[PDB]
Design a protein around this ligand. Structure first.
Ligand SMILES: O=C(O)c1ccccc1O
Length: 119
């Protein structure tokens, strides 16, 4: 269906997200480092971004729109299957980096929460 928005809200939001995405390609302290093991890094990112949506739905969904998470699938030829996981990991990571940059007070809450899994 096609709807007429005289205030162009959907389109204004798309321009904002694009300004946020661009403003980081160009141009809050954390308590731990993410796992170096790539499988564990993926699992860590899935848990953290999933918690961001539960604790901070609007902030999370802004960061995920900046990161383009909506294309990706949660965790055919193996080349493209693994590229899917890599693409998912890149977007989860960009979500976290966007939260760190624009929602620092959310990031510090999620940083203390994820520290409990780190040791
Ligand atoms: O993971 C975070 O620290 C975070 C913070 C705000 C929004 C999205 C996020 O993933």
């Amino acid at each position: 269906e096609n709807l007429y928005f005289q205030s162009m809200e959907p389109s204004k939001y798309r321009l904002c997200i694009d300004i946020l995405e661009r403003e980081i390609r160009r141009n809050p302290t954390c308590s731990h480092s993410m796992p170096e093991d790539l499988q564990m890094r993926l699992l860590y990112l899935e848990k953290r971004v999933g918690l961001a949506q539960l604790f901070f739905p609007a902030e999370a969904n802004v960061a995920m729109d900046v990161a383009n998470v909506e294309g990706t699938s949660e965790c055919e030829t193996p080349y493209v299957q693994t590229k899917r996981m890599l693409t998912r990991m890149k977007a989860l990571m960009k979500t976290v980096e966007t939260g760190r940059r624009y929602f620092p007070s959310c990031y510090e809450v999620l940083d203390k929460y994820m520290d409990q899994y780190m040791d």
